[PDB]
Amino acid sequence: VNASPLKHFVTAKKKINGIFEQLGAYIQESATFLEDTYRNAELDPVTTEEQVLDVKGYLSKVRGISEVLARRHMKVAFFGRTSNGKSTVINAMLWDKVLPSGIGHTTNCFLRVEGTDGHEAFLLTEGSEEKRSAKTVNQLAHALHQDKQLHAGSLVSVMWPNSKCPLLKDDLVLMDSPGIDVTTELDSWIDKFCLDADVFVLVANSESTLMQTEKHFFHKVSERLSRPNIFILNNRWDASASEPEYMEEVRRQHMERCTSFLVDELGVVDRSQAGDRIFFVSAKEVLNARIQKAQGMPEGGGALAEGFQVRMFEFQNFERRFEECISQSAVKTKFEQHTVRAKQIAEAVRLIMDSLHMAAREQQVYCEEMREERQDRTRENLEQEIAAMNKKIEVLDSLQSKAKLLRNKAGWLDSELNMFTHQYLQPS
Ligand SMILES: Nc1nc2c(ncn2[C@@H]2O[C@H](COP(=O)(O)OP(=O)(O)O)[C@@H](O)[C@H]2O)c(=O)[nH]1
């Protein structure tokens, strides 16, 4: 978790999935015990049909939740005016040209990059549900054009091999968006694609300023989400090297504008945190440097202007703050409610087990007093009637002991869930 913060999410996901398997086993064991106890015709009922059916229903519910928990992931979504550099930023983070991001190109739809354990990339168009190959980035871009049905509300998933990008292997999904100016029905974008985003990145043009259409979208994000994690990349900052008489003053103005936006307008970060959310970068520099590095050549070959390493460190600082943020936030956001659910379900089963225990114990006490009163009713058959009473007392004592043991197992699950909560669900 010190090496790559995203392993925090990977490890949390493994742990809570494993707890849910143990919970399923426990509920299964309990259901079998209840069902056998309900069927016992040698005793007055110590359980009800409602308890049997409730516990079976909890098993069904827990197996459904396991299916959801297995698919949970971190999601970062990128927004900004066309040609600010969104696709280049994504490609830079993935160390490769995954999404089309060249000159003369515009992406008209949402693109969603997700890892696959497969050996080849491929495309999945949502809604239409067809699968196409994407062995090169020109082949992908060819596929987005020949699909005339794609519009600003469409989404195509790019399933990219895991072995290439640790980000993707560690359960991160990256979402690219059409230019922010393409529509004003931006409510639709948030409904469809953003409510499960753990981090939002505004990729702005550092050559100009934050556009009002860009800020307006993040006003709406703040309306829909509680303290959303918002980063601002002032991209294309290599251009500033061309205007050195302005660069430091322009940086100061941009920084104050962006800080005012996040702190005083949205109120989603404090002023002392703003330096960890706003960065001045050249995504094209980073991408080309990493492509060179990946192929075994100096990273300096990616430089577009004087000051390459300064801008590179700024992008690496962004990535570090990003991974620290998304891993901690997504673990809490994506697992807290199922953790609470698992505690409620375990408690309901514990309650049922304790009720069986009490009912058996009470019936056992009744038999023990019946046994002691036999001596006043029977002398010749006293020992046989006592021995028959003893058999029923032993069956009830066995039920009470087993029920008590299963009740106690619920406490083991609740303690595992509390330790998960302590390690992974504390607020920041
Ligand atoms: N000089 C410079 N060019 C960039 C930078 N980032 C992207 N570009 C170029 O700007 C054009 C648009 O970039 P792209 O990532 O496709 O923009 P998008 O529409 O926001 O996704 C492409 O030709 C990129 O290579 C940058 O930091 N500096």
Author numbering: 24 to 400, 706 to 756
From the paper:
Outer mitochondrial membrane (OMM) fusion is catalyzed by the dynamin-like GTPase called mitofusin (MFN). We generated a modified human MFN2 construct with deletions of residues 1–21 and 401–705 (MFN2IM). MFN2IM contains a G domain and a helical domain 1 (HD1). In this study, we address these issues by presenting crystal structures of truncated human MFN2 in different stages of the GTP turnover cycle. These structures explain how MFN2 uses a primate-only single amino acid variance and a tighter G interface, as compared with human MFN1, to allow for enduring GTPase (G) domain association even after GTP hydrolysis, a feature that is unique in the dynamin superfamily and ensures efficient membrane tethering.
For the MFN2IM crystals that yielded the GDP-bound structure, the GDP was not added during purification or crystallization, but co-purified from the host E. coli cells. Somewhat unexpectedly, this GDP-bound MFN2IM forms a G domain-mediated dimer across the asymmetric units of the crystal lattice. RALS analysis revealed that the majority of freshly purified MFN2IM molecules were indeed in the dimeric form. These observations indicate that MFN2IM dimerizes during GTP hydrolysis, and the dimer remained associated after the reaction. In the crystal structure, two citrate ions were present between the associated G domains, and making contacts with both of them in a symmetrical manner. In solution, however, citrate did not affect GTP hydrolysis, or induce dimerization of GDP-bound MFN2IM, suggesting that the MFN2IM-GDP dimer in the crystal structure is not dependent on citrate. By comparing the catalytic sites between our MFN2IM-GDP structure and MFN1IM in the transition state (MFN1IM-GDP∙BeF3−), we found that their switch I regions are very similar in overall conformations, as are the positions of the catalytic threonine. On the G interface of MFN2IM, the trans interactions include (i) the central dual salt bridges between Glu230 and Arg259; (ii) a hydrophobic cluster involving Ile126 on switch I and Trp260/Val273, and (iii) other hydrogen bonds and salt bridges. Thus, our MFN2IM-GDP dimer may represent a posttransition state right after GTP hydrolysis. More importantly, Glu266 forms an MFN2-specific trans salt bridge to Lys307, whose side chain is in parallel with the guanine group of the nucleotide. This association, together with the central salt bridge and η1G, tightly enwraps the nucleotide.
